[PDB]
């Protein structure tokens, strides 16, 4: 028996996701100490990110951009930070280098979108923008999503540092030097990274809604909170506890 | 690396710390005498 109808059900979430507050943000924390905004109980438009054309990179892992409105996620961790332009491919999950092992290692297997644009016109500065920094020394490379904001002195040999810089005694981080005059590889770029989450499917972060009414006691294709299949939906004697 | 006598140990795409366990079939060496204040002219990408 083929499905008679297609059903969609979502909650009463009509408020929009605050993606402007991470995409349109005067402050992006630099690569050494990146931002993270947890998105919840809201409706997005991820197609706006491809309907608009200002981006240099819009690369997706474990998802593809077009069908996305067709999913709902538990949460999104929208990570946000600023970089030089050339090293933008370091982020892509597991690729290693100086940025990935000491600043922003993405997980081996990743279910997210990496999205980036040239920011030279707003956050290059004639002083070289020494507000924006990246780490390039650490006693070990970090685990996924791990944040470390510590700035204590590192050593590249036996030479004791005692909390101050010198020969063999290193401050762990430096600026990219974002002068407005730079090659595009050394110019600043804004980046955000949307990590999606598809767990027990209690979806609070959404694509555009457009939900439909119920059908009972006949075969239909269905979607509840992004969980989906084909079946004969019926009233039931299932005494769920109120959280299930 | 730990020699008191050495006065300059510039490393080009290398480190003395990682050198001891590093295996190399072919990277040759040269010996010569210099006026100390122009020793920088050994380095790549500069003129003199």
């Amino acid at each position: 028996v083929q499905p008679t109808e297609s059903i969609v059900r979502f909650p009463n979430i009509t408020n929009l996701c605050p993606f402007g507050e991470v995409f349109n943000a005067t402050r992006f924390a630099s690569v050494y100490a990146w931002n993270r905004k947890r998105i919840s109980n809201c409706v997005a438009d991820y197609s706006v990110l491809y309907n608009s054309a200002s981006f240099s990179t819009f690369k997706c892992y474990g998802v593809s951009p077009t069908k996305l409105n067709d999913l709902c996620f538990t949460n999104v961790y929208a990570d946000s930070f600023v970089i030089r332009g050339d090293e933008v491919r370091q982020i892509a999950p597991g690729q290693t280098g100086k940025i990935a092992d000491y600043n922003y290692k993405l997980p081996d297997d990743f279910t997210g979108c990496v999205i980036a644009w040239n920011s030279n016109n707003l956050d290059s500065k004639v002083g070289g923008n020494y507000n924006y920094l990246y780490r390039l020394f650490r006693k070990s490379n970090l685990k996924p999503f791990e944040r470390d904001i510590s700035t204590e002195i590192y050593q590249a040999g036996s030479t004791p540092c005692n909390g101050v810089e010198g020969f063999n005694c290193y401050f762990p981080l430096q600026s990219y030097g974002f002068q407005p005059t730079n090659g595009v590889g050394y110019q600043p770029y804004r980046v955000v990274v949307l990590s999606f989450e598809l767990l027990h499917a209690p979806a609070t972060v959404c694509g555009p809604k457009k939900s439909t009414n119920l059908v009972k006691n006949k075969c239909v294709n269905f979607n509840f909170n992004g969980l989906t299949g084909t079946g004969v939906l019926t009233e039931s004697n299932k005494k769920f506890l109120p959280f299930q | 690396y730990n020699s008191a006598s050495f006065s300059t140990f510039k490393c080009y795409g290398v480190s003395p710390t990682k050198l001891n366990d590093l295996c190399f079939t072919n990277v040759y060496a040269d010996s010569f005498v210099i006026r100390g204040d122009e020793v920088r002219q050994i380095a790549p990408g500069q003129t003199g």
Partner: antibody, heavy 122, light 106 residues
Framework: QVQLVQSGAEVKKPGSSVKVSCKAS????????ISWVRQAPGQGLEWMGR????????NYAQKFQGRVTITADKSTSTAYLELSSLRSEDTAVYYC????????????????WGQGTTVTVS | DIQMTQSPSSLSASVGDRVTITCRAS??????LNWYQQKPGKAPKLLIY???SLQSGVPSRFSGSGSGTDFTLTISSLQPEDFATYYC?????????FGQGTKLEI
């Protein structure tokens, strides 16, 4: 780019404790280290300590440790010094200077200096 | 760790002449050293930020003839501004110690 500007001179008593301050002009404290130095009149320069306004972490030489303390706010691009047990030999001109601890693996290049504060007894 | 000294105590010279000054210290410094000048009570200014490297926007009136430790700075065509007191300073280890300074007379 930036020029450091600094507190006016002070006349004091032996056994006193004292306050001086320095701040950016023509720019701001974009994660530079800033440091304090004594010029005793006609002697060599003596380094007091390091602070980074971006992180608040600071250090002193043993000659000044406990005798001096320093602080800074990035919120108003300003750094502060206080000194105690005055006038064992502490009649001097006190200067801030910046250096770029987050620019290369090289340090203490005091490329810009403050206006100088005299602290003295009379 | 490191003590420093600086020599000679003073010199006398003419505008446009060549004049040389020396740093000395307890240890090998691996070229981690700076050089500065002032008129008395004025804000100091840096000339050189390694054993030899001249700072950008400083004119070619100076060179650092040194390597490893116990360095020298030369004045090159002495300016009337080079009546200033000169200081060396090690950056090799904390505290970043200065030399005792030296005076040039016109």
């Amino acid at each position: 780019q930036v020029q450091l500007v600094q507190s006016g001179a002070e006349v004091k008593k032996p056994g006193s404790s004292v306050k001086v301050s320095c701040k950016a002009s023509g720019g701001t404290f974009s994660s530079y280290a800033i440091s304090w130095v004594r010029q005793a009149p006609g002697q060599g320069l003596e380094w007091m300590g390091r602070i980074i306004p971006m992180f608040g972490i600071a250090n002193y030489a043993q000659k000044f440790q406990g005798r001096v303390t320093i602080t800074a706010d990035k919120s108003t691009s300003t750094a502060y010094l206080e000194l105690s047990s005055l006038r064992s030999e502490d009649t001097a001109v006190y200067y801030c200077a910046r250096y770029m601890v987050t620019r290369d693996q090289y340090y203490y290049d005091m490329d810009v200096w403050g206006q100088g504060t005299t602290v003295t007894v009379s | 760790d490191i003590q420093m000294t600086q020599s000679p105590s003073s010199l006398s010279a003419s505008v446009g002449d060549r004049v040389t000054i020396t740093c000395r210290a307890s240890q090998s410094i691996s070229n981690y050293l700076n050089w500065y000048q002032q008129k008395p009570g004025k804000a100091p200014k840096l000339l050189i930020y390694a054993a030899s490297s001249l700072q950008s926007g400083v004119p070619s009136r100076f060179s650092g003839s040194g390597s490893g430790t116990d360095f020298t700075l030369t004045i090159s065509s002495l300016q009337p501004e080079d009546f200033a007191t000169y200081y060396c300073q090690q950056s090799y280890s904390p505290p970043p110690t200065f030399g005792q300074g030296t005076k040039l007379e016109i």
